[PDB]
Scaffold this motif. Structure first.
Motif, PDB file in Angstrom:
ATOM      1  N   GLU B   3     -38.758 -75.318 -16.997  1.00 39.54           N
ATOM      2  CA  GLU B   3     -40.201 -75.494 -17.077  1.00 39.54           C
ATOM      3  C   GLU B   3     -40.537 -76.482 -18.181  1.00 39.54           C
ATOM      4  O   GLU B   3     -40.011 -76.385 -19.292  1.00 39.54           O
ATOM      5  CB  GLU B   3     -40.877 -74.151 -17.355  1.00 39.54           C
ATOM      6  CG  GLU B   3     -42.396 -74.191 -17.528  1.00 39.54           C
ATOM      7  CD  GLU B   3     -43.160 -74.378 -16.230  1.00 39.54           C
ATOM      8  OE1 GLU B   3     -42.648 -73.986 -15.163  1.00 39.54           O
ATOM      9  OE2 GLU B   3     -44.292 -74.898 -16.278  1.00 39.54           O
ATOM     10  N   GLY B   4     -41.402 -77.443 -17.873  1.00 42.46           N
ATOM     11  CA  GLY B   4     -41.907 -78.335 -18.894  1.00 42.46           C
ATOM     12  C   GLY B   4     -42.807 -77.572 -19.841  1.00 42.46           C
ATOM     13  O   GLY B   4     -43.824 -77.000 -19.413  1.00 42.46           O
ATOM     14  N   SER B   5     -42.443 -77.521 -21.119  1.00 42.21           N
ATOM     15  CA  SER B   5     -43.239 -76.849 -22.135  1.00 42.21           C
ATOM     16  C   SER B   5     -43.524 -77.818 -23.269  1.00 42.21           C
ATOM     17  O   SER B   5     -43.004 -78.931 -23.314  1.00 42.21           O
ATOM     18  CB  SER B   5     -42.530 -75.615 -22.688  1.00 42.21           C
ATOM     19  OG  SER B   5     -41.392 -75.998 -23.437  1.00 42.21           O
ATOM     20  N   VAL B   6     -44.335 -77.364 -24.214  1.00 43.53           N
ATOM     21  CA  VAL B   6     -44.735 -78.169 -25.353  1.00 43.53           C
ATOM     22  C   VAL B   6     -43.944 -77.715 -26.565  1.00 43.53           C
ATOM     23  O   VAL B   6     -43.192 -76.744 -26.516  1.00 43.53           O
ATOM     24  CB  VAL B   6     -46.238 -78.067 -25.630  1.00 43.53           C
ATOM     25  CG1 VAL B   6     -47.022 -78.661 -24.500  1.00 43.53           C
ATOM     26  CG2 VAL B   6     -46.603 -76.615 -25.799  1.00 43.53           C
TER      27      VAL B   6
END
Lengths: 135, 158
Positions: B3-6
């Protein structure tokens, strides 16, 4: 009817079709960003990580990642996508951007995406499932 | 599969990863169907395997055509010959049954080669009756075959 005029007329009068229909009195705003499609992949090649890109500044940090700033619902892609490597590298870097700011990137595929090079022969395709299982 | 996260921070970091789920497998007291065992002579011989090794097959309305086909009910017997003027003649048969319509005389006579030529004889006679009475020039050449007796018998053997 010129390729410089008509492509810059459809990309701008089509915005007016998005401004005239949406009721801005009912809590709606829309931001307008001038990129070009070849500049945008270079801008993801610019930063070593998608969390430091230049489009990440306008989607996440100037909007959603901001105290009091209005967050971004969706990204309209005014593009014509091919299945080539400079357009699957962009969408890999837009799915990761869309998973950080929680906003899906909506755009369109072109005629050449299906491999027809002229669009009105799309119902002539008799098996589209086998077309997508090509190398 | 990431998952793309910050980057994590003092601000809050919402991410979307769907969870494994909780099923809590539901009880279902199924009941006992009234199972009967139909026992009895179903083929035309006595099988050499002892009873404790052979199996029971389950039949319902949908698979009755497949249980009958895989049984291979092969009935071989010597019956009386009534196709000629002999009373004391016998004629064995060979039967292979694969469907319920194989009991019918359309498929029993089709498996007897002495009756394959008699249905073919009848099919040749039903084919004649259509164009027979429509053209009245057929009887004109029956008298020519009554006249030309030599060339007629040379063509009957062909």
């Amino acid at each position: 009817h010129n390729s410089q005029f008509q492509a810059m007329e459809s990309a701008w009068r089509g915005l007016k079709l998005f401004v005239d229909r949406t009721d801005f009195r009912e809590n709606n705003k829309v931001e307008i960003l001038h990129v070009t499609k070849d500049e945008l992949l270079e801008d993801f090649e610019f930063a070593p990580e998608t969390a430091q890109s230049g489009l990440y500044k306008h989607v996440y940090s100037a909007g959603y990642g901001q105290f009091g700033g209005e967050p971004v619902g969706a990204i309209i892609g005014n593009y014509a996508f091919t299945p080539s490597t400079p357009d699957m590298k962009l969408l890999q870097y837009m799915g990761a951007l869309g998973a950080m700011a929680h906003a899906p990137f909506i755009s369109s595929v072109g005629p050449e995406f299906f491999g027809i090079d002229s669009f009105e022969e799309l119902p002539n395709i008799k098996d589209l499932k086998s077309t997508f299982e090509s190398p | 599969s990431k998952e793309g996260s910050v980057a994590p921070k003092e601000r809050i970091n919402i991410k979307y990863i769907p969870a494994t789920g909780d099923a809590q497998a539901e009880v279902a007291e199924v009941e006992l169907p009234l199972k009967t065992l139909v026992v009895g002579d179903f083929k035309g011989h006595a099988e050499q395997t002892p009873l404790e090794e052979r199996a029971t097959v389950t039949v319902d309305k949908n698979n009755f055509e497949a249980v009958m086909r895989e049984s291979e009910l092969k009935i071989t017997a010597t019956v009386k010959n009534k196709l000629t003027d002999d009373e004391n003649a016998e004629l064995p048969v060979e039967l292979n049954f694969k469907s319920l319509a194989d009991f019918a005389p359309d498929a029993v006579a089709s498996q007897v080669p002495e009756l394959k030529k008699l249905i073919e004889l009848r099919e040749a006679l039903v084919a004649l009756k259509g164009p027979l009475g429509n053209i009245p020039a057929f009887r004109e050449r029956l008298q020519s075959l009554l006249n030309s007796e030599e060339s007629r018998e040379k063509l009957l053997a062909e």
